[PDB]
Amino acid sequence: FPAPDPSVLVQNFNISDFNGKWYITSGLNPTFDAFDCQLHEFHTEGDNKLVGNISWRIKTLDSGFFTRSAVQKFVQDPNQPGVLYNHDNEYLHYQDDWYILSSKIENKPEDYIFVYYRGRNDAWDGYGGAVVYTRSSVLPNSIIPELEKAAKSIGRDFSTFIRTDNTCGP
Amino acid sequence: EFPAPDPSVLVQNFNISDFNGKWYITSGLNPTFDAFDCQLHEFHTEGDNKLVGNISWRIKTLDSGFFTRSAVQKFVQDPNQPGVLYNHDNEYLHYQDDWYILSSKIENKPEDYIFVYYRGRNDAWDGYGGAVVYTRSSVLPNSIIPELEKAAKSIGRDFSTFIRTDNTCGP
Ligand SMILES: [Gd]
Ligand SMILES: [Gd]
Numbered sequence: 001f002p003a004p005d006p007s008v009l010v011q012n013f014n015i016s017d018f019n020g021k022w023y024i025t026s027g028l029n030p031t032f033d034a035f036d037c038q039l040h041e042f043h044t045e046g047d048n049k050l051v052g053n054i055s056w057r058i059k060t061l062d063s064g065f066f067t068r069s070a071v072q073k074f075v076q077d078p079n080q081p082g083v084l085y086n087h088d089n090e091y092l093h094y095q096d097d098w099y100i101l102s103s104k105i106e107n108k109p110e111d112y113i114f115v116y117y118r119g120r121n122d123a124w125d126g127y128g129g130a131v132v133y134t135r136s137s138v139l140p141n142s143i144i145p146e147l148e149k150a151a152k153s154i155g156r157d158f159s160t161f162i163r164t165d166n167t168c169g170p
Numbered sequence: 171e172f173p174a175p176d177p178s179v180l181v182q183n184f185n186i187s188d189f190n191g192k193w194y195i196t197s198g199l200n201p202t203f204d205a206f207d208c209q210l211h212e213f214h215t216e217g218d219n220k221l222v223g224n225i226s227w228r229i230k231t232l233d234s235g236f237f238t239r240s241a242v243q244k245f246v247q248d249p250n251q252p253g254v255l256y257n258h259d260n261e262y263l264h265y266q267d268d269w270y271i272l273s274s275k276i277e278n279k280p281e282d283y284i285f286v287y288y289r290g291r292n293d294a295w296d297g298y299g300g301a302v303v304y305t306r307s308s309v310l311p312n313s314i315i316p317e318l319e320k321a322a323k324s325i326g327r328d329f330s331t332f333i334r335t336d337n338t339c340g341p
């Protein structure tokens with residue numbers, strides 16, 4: 001997961017377009033929760049920040065667990081609108097960086113944002129992947145050509161991505 | 171143990187099509203470590219008898235990897251007891267999940283709720299169960315709490331012990 005060339009990122013991006021409900025309907029590097037509900041609702045904070053809810057779990061010596069909600073907040077790069085940083089993490093001690101490869105926002109059913117992500121913490125510096133957020137719970141057929149072009153721009157191939165439609169859903 | 175509840179304590183009328191659409195689980199008697207992940211479920215009705223939604227299946231393999239799949243889970247309503255729904259139904263998955271509707275208010279208002287007590291079994295264990303509140307809202311409404319306390323009481327439980335999980339899909 002090397003950082004992308006700045007030239008392959010969207011050159012303009014308004015973090016306000018991340019507001020509200022988005023489904024993750026495709027991903028490069030899924031986990032075993034790939035088919036659980038993939039709805040995320042985000043909120044903008046001010047000018048340059050995006051906020052959403054995350055969850056924290058510890059597994060203890062009795063086979064029990066403790067869990068908590070937390071926030072994850074991203075700040076946009078002031079020179080590269082397609083780069084967002086979440087370093088931000090206090091007790092949690094990790095960094096997650098987002099790179100917007102491709103996006104179409106027409107306030108239409110087919111709107112999407114394609115994010116490549118990379119991360120690190122004390123245990124490992126290898127974290128990363130790529131996900132497609134769509135307004136629709138079903139990835140729209142019409143956006144696949146642009147997704148294929150975006151994936152190819154970072155040396156990937158979109159046909160390798162897992163497809164996860166209607167994950168909450170009807 | 172989660173025994174079968176007294177039939178008299180269940181809702182005496184229930185229309186399964188009232189389960190259609192989007193519901194959030196905003197409270198539960200016994201959570202798993204995924205309690206704070208998004209608790210949105212979208213249900214639909216099949217025929218006039220059956221409630222359907224999407225579930226997920228995982229296996230963890232010897233190499234530390236995994237395989238996963240979407241599946242569906244289908245409930246049928248008991249014809250004599252509107253508040254009893256059965257998911258036996260399950261093919262190669264080999265499990266049973268029974269739902270007992272303790273309390274519900276459906277008025278097509280933001281505070282609508284359905285309070286489900288559940289019990290289950292598979293080859294590994296017969297001890298599965300718990301109780302969850304489905305709400306139309308992503309936040310459990312303060313106004314339904316006295317009915318929930320009463321419903322919890324009817325099966326020998328206390329609503330105050332339940333986990334509260336508001337805004338689980340985002341702020
Ligand atoms: Gd990699
Ligand atoms: Gd750095």
Ligand SMILES: [Gd]
Nearest residue numbers: 171172297299
């Ligand atoms: Gd029990």
